[PDB]
Coordinates of C-alpha atoms in Angstrom, one line a residue:
Chain O
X1 CA -44.8 -6.8 33.8
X2 CA -47.8 -4.8 33.2
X3 CA -46.9 -3.6 29.7
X4 CA -50.0 -0.5 29.5
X5 CA -48.1 1.1 32.0
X6 CA -45.2 1.4 30.1
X7 CA -47.2 2.9 27.4
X8 CA -49.8 5.0 29.0
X9 CA -49.7 7.3 32.1
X10 CA -52.3 6.8 34.9
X11 CA -54.6 9.6 33.6
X12 CA -55.0 8.0 30.3
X13 CA -55.8 4.5 31.8
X14 CA -58.5 6.0 33.8
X15 CA -60.6 6.8 30.9
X16 CA -60.4 3.0 29.6
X17 CA -62.9 0.9 30.8
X18 CA -61.6 -2.4 32.8
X19 CA -62.6 -5.0 30.0
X20 CA -61.0 -3.0 27.5
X21 CA -57.8 -2.6 29.5
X22 CA -57.3 -6.3 30.0
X23 CA -58.2 -6.8 26.1
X24 CA -55.0 -4.4 25.6
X25 CA -52.7 -6.1 28.3
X26 CA -53.5 -9.5 27.2
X27 CA -52.6 -8.9 23.8
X28 CA -49.9 -7.1 25.0
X29 CA -48.5 -9.6 27.4
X30 CA -49.0 -11.9 24.6
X31 CA -46.7 -10.5 22.1
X32 CA -44.1 -9.7 24.6
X33 CA -43.7 -13.5 25.9
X34 CA -43.2 -14.3 22.4
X35 CA -40.6 -11.7 22.4
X36 CA -38.8 -13.2 25.1
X37 CA -39.6 -16.7 23.6
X38 CA -37.8 -16.0 20.9
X39 CA -34.7 -14.3 22.4
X40 CA -34.3 -17.2 24.7
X41 CA -34.5 -19.7 22.0
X42 CA -32.3 -18.0 19.7
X43 CA -29.7 -17.6 22.5
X44 CA -29.5 -21.0 23.3
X45 CA -29.6 -22.0 19.7
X46 CA -26.6 -20.2 19.1
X47 CA -24.4 -21.5 22.3
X48 CA -25.6 -25.1 21.1
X49 CA -24.3 -24.4 17.8
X50 CA -21.0 -23.1 18.5
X51 CA -20.5 -25.7 20.9
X52 CA -21.5 -28.9 18.4
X53 CA -18.9 -26.6 15.9
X54 CA -16.3 -26.4 18.6
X55 CA -16.7 -30.3 19.3
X56 CA -16.2 -31.4 15.6
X57 CA -13.4 -28.9 14.9
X58 CA -11.5 -31.1 17.8
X59 CA -12.5 -34.1 16.1
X60 CA -10.9 -33.0 12.8
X61 CA -7.7 -31.4 14.7
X62 CA -7.4 -35.0 16.2
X63 CA -7.9 -36.8 12.9
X64 CA -5.2 -34.5 10.8
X65 CA -2.9 -35.9 13.8
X66 CA -3.2 -38.9 13.3
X67 CA -2.7 -38.6 9.5
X68 CA 0.4 -36.4 9.7
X69 CA 2.1 -39.1 12.3
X70 CA 0.7 -42.0 9.9
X71 CA 2.5 -40.2 7.0
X72 CA 5.6 -40.0 9.1
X73 CA 5.3 -43.3 10.3
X74 CA 4.7 -44.8 6.5
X75 CA 8.0 -42.7 5.7
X76 CA 10.1 -44.1 8.3
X77 CA 9.2 -47.5 7.2
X78 CA 10.2 -46.8 3.5
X79 CA 13.8 -45.3 4.8
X80 CA 13.9 -48.7 7.2
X81 CA 13.0 -51.2 4.0
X82 CA 15.5 -49.4 1.6
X83 CA 18.2 -49.6 3.9
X84 CA 17.6 -53.6 4.6
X85 CA 17.4 -54.8 0.9
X86 CA 21.0 -53.1 0.8
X87 CA 22.2 -55.3 3.9
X88 CA 20.2 -58.3 2.4
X89 CA 22.0 -57.9 -1.1
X90 CA 25.6 -57.3 0.7
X91 CA 25.1 -60.1 3.0
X92 CA 23.8 -62.3 0.0
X93 CA 26.9 -61.4 -2.4
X94 CA 29.4 -62.2 0.9
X95 CA 27.7 -65.1 1.3
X96 CA 28.2 -66.5 -2.3
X97 CA 31.7 -65.7 -1.9
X98 CA 32.2 -67.7 1.0
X99 CA 30.7 -70.5 -0.7
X100 CA 32.9 -70.3 -3.4
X101 CA 35.7 -70.1 -1.1
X102 CA 34.6 -73.0 0.6
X103 CA 34.3 -74.9 -2.6
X104 CA 37.6 -74.1 -3.3
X105 CA 38.9 -75.3 0.2
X106 CA 37.7 -78.2 -0.3
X107 CA 39.0 -78.7 -3.8
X108 CA 42.4 -78.1 -2.4
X109 CA 42.2 -80.5 1.0
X110 CA 41.3 -83.0 -1.5
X111 CA 44.6 -82.9 -3.4
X112 CA 46.6 -82.2 -0.8
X113 CA 45.2 -85.6 1.3
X114 CA 46.0 -87.5 -1.9
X115 CA 49.7 -86.0 -2.3
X116 CA 49.9 -86.5 1.4
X117 CA 49.4 -90.5 0.5
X118 CA 51.6 -90.6 -2.2
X119 CA 54.3 -89.1 -0.1
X120 CA 53.8 -91.3 2.5
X121 CA 53.6 -94.6 0.5
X122 CA 56.9 -93.6 -1.1
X123 CA 58.6 -92.9 2.6
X124 CA 57.5 -96.3 3.6
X125 CA 59.2 -97.9 0.3
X126 CA 62.3 -95.9 1.2
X127 CA 61.9 -97.0 4.7
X128 CA 61.9 -100.6 3.4
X129 CA 65.0 -100.2 1.6
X130 CA 66.7 -98.4 4.3
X131 CA 66.0 -101.2 6.5
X132 CA 67.1 -103.7 3.7
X133 CA 70.7 -102.2 3.4
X134 CA 71.2 -102.4 7.1
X135 CA 70.3 -105.8 7.2
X136 CA 72.6 -106.5 4.3
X137 CA 75.6 -104.6 6.0
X138 CA 74.9 -106.5 9.3
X139 CA 75.6 -109.6 7.3
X140 CA 78.9 -108.6 6.3
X141 CA 80.9 -107.6 9.5
Chain J
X1 CA -51.6 -2.6 9.5
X2 CA -53.3 -1.3 12.5
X3 CA -54.3 -4.6 14.7
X4 CA -55.6 -2.4 17.4
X5 CA -59.1 -2.8 14.9
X6 CA -58.9 -6.7 15.9
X7 CA -58.0 -6.4 19.6
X8 CA -61.0 -3.7 20.2
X9 CA -64.4 -3.7 18.8
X10 CA -65.1 -0.4 16.6
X11 CA -67.0 1.1 19.2
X12 CA -64.3 0.8 22.0
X13 CA -61.6 1.8 19.7
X14 CA -64.0 5.0 18.7
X15 CA -64.1 6.1 22.5
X16 CA -60.2 6.3 22.9
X17 CA -58.7 9.4 22.9
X18 CA -56.8 9.6 19.4
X19 CA -53.8 10.6 21.3
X20 CA -54.3 6.7 22.9
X21 CA -55.1 4.9 20.2
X22 CA -51.6 6.3 18.4
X23 CA -49.5 5.2 21.2
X24 CA -51.2 2.1 21.4
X25 CA -51.1 1.2 17.7
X26 CA -47.2 2.5 17.7
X27 CA -46.1 -0.2 20.7
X28 CA -47.6 -2.7 19.2
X29 CA -45.9 -2.3 15.5
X30 CA -43.1 -1.9 17.9
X31 CA -43.3 -4.9 19.1
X32 CA -44.0 -6.7 15.9
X33 CA -41.4 -5.6 14.0
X34 CA -38.8 -6.5 16.5
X35 CA -40.5 -10.0 16.2
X36 CA -39.8 -10.1 12.6
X37 CA -36.4 -8.9 13.0
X38 CA -35.4 -11.7 15.7
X39 CA -37.2 -14.4 13.3
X40 CA -34.8 -13.0 10.5
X41 CA -31.7 -12.7 12.0
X42 CA -32.2 -16.4 13.3
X43 CA -32.9 -17.6 10.4
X44 CA -29.9 -16.1 8.7
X45 CA -27.5 -16.8 11.2
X46 CA -29.3 -20.6 11.4
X47 CA -28.2 -21.0 7.4
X48 CA -25.1 -19.7 7.9
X49 CA -23.9 -21.9 10.9
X50 CA -25.5 -25.0 9.2
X51 CA -23.0 -24.2 5.8
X52 CA -20.2 -23.9 8.1
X53 CA -20.4 -27.2 9.9
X54 CA -21.3 -29.3 6.9
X55 CA -17.9 -27.6 5.4
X56 CA -15.8 -28.9 8.4
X57 CA -17.7 -32.6 7.9
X58 CA -16.5 -32.6 4.0
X59 CA -13.0 -31.7 5.6
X60 CA -13.1 -34.1 8.6
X61 CA -14.6 -37.1 6.0
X62 CA -11.5 -36.2 3.7
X63 CA -9.3 -36.5 6.8
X64 CA -10.5 -40.3 7.4
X65 CA -10.0 -41.1 3.7
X66 CA -6.6 -40.0 3.8
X67 CA -5.9 -41.7 6.9
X68 CA -7.0 -44.9 4.8
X69 CA -5.3 -44.5 2.5
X70 CA -1.7 -43.6 4.4
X71 CA -2.7 -46.7 7.0
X72 CA -2.7 -49.1 4.3
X73 CA 0.2 -48.4 2.7
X74 CA 1.9 -48.7 6.1
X75 CA 0.2 -52.1 6.8
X76 CA 2.0 -53.5 3.7
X77 CA 5.4 -51.9 4.8
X78 CA 5.3 -53.6 8.2
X79 CA 4.5 -57.1 6.3
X80 CA 7.3 -56.5 3.9
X81 CA 9.4 -55.4 6.9
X82 CA 8.5 -58.4 9.0
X83 CA 9.5 -60.7 6.0
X84 CA 13.0 -59.0 5.1
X85 CA 13.8 -59.0 8.7
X86 CA 13.3 -62.7 9.1
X87 CA 15.7 -63.3 5.5
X88 CA 18.1 -60.9 7.4
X89 CA 18.0 -63.2 10.4
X90 CA 18.7 -66.4 8.6
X91 CA 21.6 -65.1 6.2
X92 CA 23.4 -63.7 9.2
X93 CA 23.3 -67.3 10.4
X94 CA 24.5 -68.7 7.3
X95 CA 26.9 -66.3 7.1
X96 CA 28.2 -67.0 11.1
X97 CA 28.6 -70.7 10.2
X98 CA 30.6 -70.2 7.1
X99 CA 32.9 -67.7 8.3
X100 CA 33.5 -70.4 11.2
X101 CA 33.9 -73.4 8.7
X102 CA 36.3 -71.1 6.6
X103 CA 38.7 -70.5 9.7
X104 CA 38.7 -74.3 10.5
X105 CA 39.4 -74.9 7.0
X106 CA 42.4 -72.4 6.5
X107 CA 43.7 -74.1 10.3
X108 CA 43.3 -77.7 8.4
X109 CA 45.3 -76.4 5.5
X110 CA 48.4 -74.8 7.2
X111 CA 48.6 -78.1 9.2
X112 CA 48.5 -80.1 6.3
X113 CA 51.3 -77.9 4.4
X114 CA 53.6 -78.2 7.6
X115 CA 52.8 -81.9 7.8
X116 CA 53.9 -82.0 3.7
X117 CA 57.2 -80.2 4.4
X118 CA 58.0 -82.5 7.2
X119 CA 57.3 -85.5 5.0
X120 CA 59.8 -84.0 2.1
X121 CA 62.4 -83.3 4.7
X122 CA 62.5 -87.0 5.8
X123 CA 62.0 -88.2 1.9
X124 CA 65.2 -86.1 1.0
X125 CA 66.9 -87.9 4.6
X126 CA 65.9 -91.3 3.7
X127 CA 67.4 -90.9 0.1
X128 CA 70.9 -89.5 1.1
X129 CA 71.2 -92.0 3.9
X130 CA 69.9 -94.9 1.4
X131 CA 72.6 -93.8 -1.3
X132 CA 75.6 -93.9 1.7
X133 CA 74.3 -97.1 3.3
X134 CA 74.7 -98.6 -0.5
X135 CA 78.1 -97.1 -0.9
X136 CA 79.1 -98.8 2.6
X137 CA 78.3 -102.3 1.3
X138 CA 81.1 -102.1 -1.0
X139 CA 83.9 -101.3 1.4
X140 CA 86.6 -102.9 2.4
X141 CA 88.2 -104.0 6.0
Chain E
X1 CA -58.9 -10.6 0.6
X2 CA -60.4 -8.7 -2.4
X3 CA -57.6 -9.3 -5.2
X4 CA -60.0 -8.4 -8.2
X5 CA -59.4 -4.6 -7.6
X6 CA -55.8 -4.8 -9.1
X7 CA -56.6 -6.3 -12.5
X8 CA -59.7 -3.9 -13.2
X9 CA -60.0 -0.4 -13.1
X10 CA -63.0 1.4 -10.7
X11 CA -65.5 1.8 -13.4
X12 CA -65.0 -1.5 -14.8
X13 CA -65.5 -3.1 -11.3
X14 CA -68.3 -1.6 -10.1
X15 CA -70.0 -2.7 -13.2
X16 CA -69.5 -6.2 -12.8
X17 CA -72.8 -7.9 -11.1
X18 CA -72.1 -8.6 -7.3
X19 CA -72.7 -12.5 -8.2
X20 CA -69.7 -12.2 -11.1
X21 CA -67.1 -10.5 -8.3
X22 CA -68.3 -13.1 -5.9
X23 CA -67.0 -16.0 -8.2
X24 CA -64.2 -14.4 -9.3
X25 CA -62.8 -13.5 -6.0
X26 CA -63.3 -16.6 -4.6
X27 CA -61.7 -18.4 -7.5
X28 CA -59.1 -16.2 -6.9
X29 CA -58.8 -16.9 -3.5
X30 CA -58.8 -20.7 -4.1
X31 CA -55.9 -20.7 -6.7
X32 CA -53.9 -18.4 -4.1
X33 CA -54.4 -21.3 -1.6
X34 CA -53.0 -23.9 -3.9
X35 CA -50.2 -21.7 -4.3
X36 CA -49.7 -21.5 -0.6
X37 CA -50.5 -25.2 0.0
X38 CA -47.9 -26.0 -2.7
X39 CA -45.0 -23.7 -1.0
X40 CA -45.7 -25.2 2.3
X41 CA -45.7 -28.6 1.3
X42 CA -42.2 -28.1 -0.8
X43 CA -40.4 -26.8 2.6
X44 CA -42.1 -29.7 4.5
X45 CA -41.1 -32.0 1.8
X46 CA -37.1 -30.5 1.6
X47 CA -36.7 -30.5 5.5
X48 CA -37.8 -34.4 5.3
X49 CA -35.4 -35.1 2.7
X50 CA -32.3 -33.2 4.4
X51 CA -33.1 -35.2 8.0
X52 CA -33.0 -38.2 5.6
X53 CA -29.9 -37.9 4.1
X54 CA -28.4 -36.4 7.2
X55 CA -29.8 -39.6 8.9
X56 CA -27.6 -41.8 6.4
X57 CA -24.9 -39.6 5.8
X58 CA -24.1 -40.8 9.8
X59 CA -25.1 -44.1 8.9
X60 CA -21.8 -44.1 6.1
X61 CA -19.5 -42.4 8.1
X62 CA -20.6 -45.2 11.2
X63 CA -19.7 -47.9 8.4
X64 CA -16.5 -46.7 7.5
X65 CA -15.6 -46.5 11.7
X66 CA -16.3 -50.1 11.6
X67 CA -14.4 -50.7 8.7
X68 CA -11.2 -48.9 10.0
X69 CA -11.4 -51.4 13.3
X70 CA -12.1 -54.6 11.2
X71 CA -9.3 -53.8 8.8
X72 CA -6.7 -53.1 11.7
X73 CA -8.0 -56.4 13.3
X74 CA -7.0 -58.2 9.8
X75 CA -3.9 -56.2 9.5
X76 CA -2.8 -57.5 12.9
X77 CA -3.7 -60.9 12.2
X78 CA -1.7 -61.2 9.0
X79 CA 1.5 -59.9 10.9
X80 CA 1.2 -62.8 13.2
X81 CA 0.8 -65.1 10.7
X82 CA 3.6 -64.3 8.8
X83 CA 5.8 -64.3 11.5
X84 CA 4.3 -67.7 12.3
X85 CA 5.0 -69.0 8.9
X86 CA 8.4 -68.3 9.4
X87 CA 8.7 -69.8 12.7
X88 CA 7.4 -73.1 10.7
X89 CA 9.8 -72.7 7.7
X90 CA 12.8 -72.7 10.3
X91 CA 11.9 -75.7 12.4
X92 CA 10.9 -77.5 9.2
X93 CA 14.3 -77.1 7.8
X94 CA 16.1 -77.7 11.1
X95 CA 14.0 -81.2 11.7
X96 CA 14.9 -82.1 8.0
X97 CA 18.9 -81.5 9.0
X98 CA 18.4 -83.5 12.0
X99 CA 16.8 -86.4 10.2
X100 CA 19.5 -86.5 7.9
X101 CA 21.9 -86.6 10.9
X102 CA 20.4 -89.8 12.9
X103 CA 20.6 -91.7 9.4
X104 CA 24.3 -90.8 9.1
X105 CA 24.7 -92.0 13.0
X106 CA 22.9 -95.1 12.3
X107 CA 25.1 -95.9 9.7
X108 CA 28.3 -95.2 12.1
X109 CA 27.1 -97.2 14.8
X110 CA 26.5 -100.2 12.6
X111 CA 29.9 -100.1 11.2
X112 CA 31.1 -99.5 14.8
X113 CA 29.2 -102.7 15.7
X114 CA 30.9 -104.9 12.9
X115 CA 34.1 -103.4 13.7
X116 CA 33.6 -104.8 17.2
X117 CA 32.5 -108.2 16.1
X118 CA 35.5 -108.2 14.0
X119 CA 37.9 -107.8 17.1
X120 CA 35.9 -110.5 18.9
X121 CA 36.7 -112.8 16.3
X122 CA 40.2 -111.9 16.7
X123 CA 40.0 -112.4 20.2
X124 CA 38.9 -115.7 20.2
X125 CA 41.2 -116.8 17.3
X126 CA 44.4 -115.6 19.8
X127 CA 42.7 -117.6 22.6
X128 CA 42.2 -120.7 20.9
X129 CA 46.0 -120.3 19.9
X130 CA 47.6 -119.4 22.8
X131 CA 46.0 -122.6 24.2
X132 CA 47.3 -124.8 21.5
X133 CA 50.7 -123.2 21.8
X134 CA 50.8 -123.1 25.4
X135 CA 50.3 -127.0 25.0
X136 CA 53.0 -127.8 22.4
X137 CA 55.3 -126.1 24.9
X138 CA 54.7 -128.1 27.9
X139 CA 54.4 -131.1 25.8
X140 CA 58.5 -130.5 25.8
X141 CA 58.7 -130.8 29.8
Chain D
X1 CA -56.5 -23.1 -21.5
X2 CA -59.4 -20.4 -21.2
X3 CA -59.8 -20.1 -17.1
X4 CA -62.6 -17.6 -17.1
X5 CA -64.9 -20.2 -19.0
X6 CA -64.6 -22.2 -16.2
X7 CA -65.5 -20.0 -13.4
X8 CA -68.1 -18.0 -14.8
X9 CA -71.3 -18.9 -17.1
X10 CA -71.6 -18.0 -20.3
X11 CA -74.8 -15.6 -19.8
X12 CA -72.3 -13.8 -17.1
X13 CA -69.5 -13.7 -19.7
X14 CA -71.7 -12.9 -22.6
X15 CA -72.4 -9.3 -20.4
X16 CA -68.8 -9.0 -19.7
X17 CA -67.3 -6.2 -22.3
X18 CA -64.3 -7.8 -24.1
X19 CA -61.6 -5.8 -22.8
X20 CA -62.9 -6.6 -19.4
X21 CA -62.5 -10.4 -20.2
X22 CA -59.4 -9.9 -21.5
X23 CA -57.9 -8.2 -18.7
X24 CA -59.2 -11.1 -16.5
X25 CA -57.8 -14.2 -18.7
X26 CA -54.9 -12.5 -18.4
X27 CA -54.3 -12.0 -14.6
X28 CA -55.8 -15.6 -14.0
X29 CA -53.3 -16.8 -16.7
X30 CA -50.3 -14.9 -14.8
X31 CA -51.4 -16.7 -11.5
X32 CA -52.0 -20.2 -13.3
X33 CA -48.2 -19.6 -14.3
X34 CA -47.3 -19.1 -11.1
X35 CA -48.9 -22.3 -9.7
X36 CA -47.6 -24.4 -12.6
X37 CA -44.2 -22.9 -12.3
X38 CA -43.7 -23.8 -8.6
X39 CA -45.1 -27.4 -9.3
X40 CA -42.2 -27.6 -11.8
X41 CA -39.9 -26.0 -9.2
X42 CA -40.5 -28.8 -6.6
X43 CA -40.8 -31.6 -9.0
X44 CA -37.3 -30.3 -10.4
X45 CA -35.9 -30.0 -6.8
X46 CA -37.7 -33.2 -5.3
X47 CA -35.8 -35.5 -8.3
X48 CA -32.6 -34.0 -7.8
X49 CA -32.4 -35.2 -4.3
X50 CA -33.9 -38.3 -4.8
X51 CA -30.8 -39.2 -7.0
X52 CA -29.0 -37.8 -4.6
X53 CA -29.8 -39.9 -2.0
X54 CA -29.7 -43.5 -4.7
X55 CA -26.0 -42.2 -4.8
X56 CA -25.4 -42.1 -0.8
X57 CA -27.2 -45.3 -0.7
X58 CA -24.7 -47.0 -3.1
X59 CA -21.7 -45.7 -1.2
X60 CA -23.5 -47.1 2.2
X61 CA -24.1 -50.7 0.3
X62 CA -20.8 -50.4 -0.6
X63 CA -19.0 -49.6 2.9
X64 CA -21.3 -52.5 4.5
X65 CA -20.2 -54.9 1.7
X66 CA -16.8 -54.0 2.1
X67 CA -17.3 -54.6 6.0
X68 CA -18.9 -58.0 5.5
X69 CA -15.5 -59.2 3.8
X70 CA -13.3 -58.1 5.9
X71 CA -15.3 -59.4 9.1
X72 CA -15.2 -62.6 7.3
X73 CA -11.6 -62.3 6.4
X74 CA -10.7 -61.9 10.3
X75 CA -12.7 -65.0 11.3
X76 CA -10.8 -67.0 8.6
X77 CA -7.5 -65.5 9.3
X78 CA -7.9 -66.6 13.4
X79 CA -8.7 -69.8 12.2
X80 CA -5.7 -70.2 9.9
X81 CA -3.7 -69.1 13.1
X82 CA -4.9 -71.8 15.4
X83 CA -4.4 -74.2 12.6
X84 CA -0.7 -73.3 12.5
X85 CA -0.1 -73.4 15.6
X86 CA -1.2 -76.9 16.0
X87 CA 1.3 -77.4 13.6
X88 CA 3.8 -75.6 15.0
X89 CA 3.3 -77.7 18.6
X90 CA 3.9 -80.9 16.5
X91 CA 6.6 -79.5 15.0
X92 CA 8.0 -78.5 18.1
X93 CA 7.4 -81.9 19.8
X94 CA 9.1 -83.6 17.1
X95 CA 12.0 -81.5 17.1
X96 CA 12.6 -82.5 20.9
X97 CA 12.5 -86.2 20.2
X98 CA 14.9 -85.8 17.5
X99 CA 17.4 -83.7 19.8
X100 CA 16.9 -86.5 22.4
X101 CA 17.6 -89.2 19.5
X102 CA 20.5 -87.5 18.6
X103 CA 21.9 -87.2 22.5
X104 CA 20.9 -90.7 22.6
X105 CA 23.0 -91.7 20.1
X106 CA 26.1 -89.9 21.3
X107 CA 25.9 -91.8 24.8
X108 CA 25.7 -94.9 22.7
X109 CA 28.6 -94.1 20.5
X110 CA 30.5 -93.3 23.6
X111 CA 29.5 -96.4 25.2
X112 CA 31.0 -98.5 22.2
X113 CA 34.0 -96.6 21.9
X114 CA 35.1 -97.4 25.6
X115 CA 34.4 -100.9 24.8
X116 CA 36.3 -100.9 22.1
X117 CA 38.9 -99.5 23.4
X118 CA 39.3 -102.2 26.2
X119 CA 38.6 -105.0 23.6
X120 CA 41.8 -103.5 21.8
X121 CA 43.8 -103.5 25.4
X122 CA 42.9 -107.4 25.8
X123 CA 43.7 -108.0 22.1
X124 CA 47.2 -106.2 22.5
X125 CA 48.0 -108.5 25.5
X126 CA 46.5 -111.3 24.0
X127 CA 49.3 -110.8 21.5
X128 CA 52.1 -110.0 23.6
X129 CA 51.4 -113.4 25.1
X130 CA 51.4 -115.1 21.4
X131 CA 54.4 -113.9 20.3
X132 CA 56.1 -114.6 23.4
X133 CA 54.9 -118.4 23.3
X134 CA 55.8 -118.4 19.5
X135 CA 59.5 -117.6 20.1
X136 CA 59.8 -119.8 22.6
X137 CA 58.4 -122.7 20.6
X138 CA 60.6 -121.7 17.6
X139 CA 64.0 -121.5 20.0
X140 CA 62.8 -125.4 20.8
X141 CA 61.7 -126.6 17.8

């Protein structure tokens, strides 16, 4: 990487004292290594900054992914809840209905049981009369 | 801005053919301008990529915020869902038993009615027979 | 760094004593160095406060991340809690019905027992009587 | 505010033409305004980022405070579940004992019922014998 040989032809370099050549070549080299250094860093920086952005783009899209899914999840629960409350209200009303029928049935069966007892009492008395009449007939002939 | 004057002393410089001095001052200036351009371009890129990075950070933090908002809503719905499903299970069981009792009550009432009919037919038959037996007490032989 | 040449014309300047030009250009330099000093110290401060802010931003997001995890844990505990309470309520009512049933079966068992004791008394009386009747018939030998 | 009087002595100043003093003082004042302007612009920036930082610190302190509460809420919820599970185990056991008691009582009532029927069979045989003995005794007496 001798820079003076890019800048000057041999014939020109010959007219330069060696110390002067060295002063120049050292300065040229210093500037050139700064140039190489800058280009090296700049390129590394670009690549790094892009990779950092690429990675947070992925983090974003994943976050957005979770939010869409979570939004759907909520909506499906709400829809599900609406239907459950309609089921509950229906069941509730149906059981109120059955409660009412049950109380009516209890009332009815109790009344029937009384009537049955009265009839059976009547039947007992009729039988008593019946056996009495039979007995009196056998006491004739 | 001839930097060559700082690299070489005035005597050394004056003993250079002017064509050589010019070639050196030109090349030196070229390198310095490239250096200034590299720094300029990098500082431009640096600033722009930073701006873009901070923008997507803002977006990501907003997505996380919305997700908190939605997640909170879902979690309350799930609890609400659990509670209603347990009410639902209970009502269903209460309904099952009530309808079982209803069937038994219906069966019981149909047998009560069947029994009542038989009792009333028996009663009417006893009354007819006793009316007849009474008449027969007064017969002659 | 002789700035003085800008503010004063050629004759005005050359008519200034050496000590005056030296004093003026030194003062101008000192004020320029305060200026450059201010500029460099600001840029230093600027970077430092950005770095400081950048750090707290990450601390904030780390705090929100910790909170998401914590809240998820609390909500799943609350879900188990609801489930657990409803199991308890069921059992509590189930047991209470069993306790009522127990009280009824105990009342039945005591009644059955008095029934049994009544039967045993009747049997003892029957046996005493049949012994007496037997004796009275044997006395007719 | 006369800057020129600070840098130069009265003897040097007297020997300056007035127009020249005015040019110098005007230039010095300009440079001084630049100095003061930078000190003002820094101080402006400084206070602005200072306040911005206080605001992000509030958000951090708030997030942390919320985390503390949630963290504490979770520990207490874990203890509620352990406590309720303890009660649940106790209820389950009581339930198991109740059902076993119910089973014991069914068994007892089945034994009693078998005993009852055997008592009633003995009674009927005793009654048949009694009726036989009475009729024979009624015939002879």
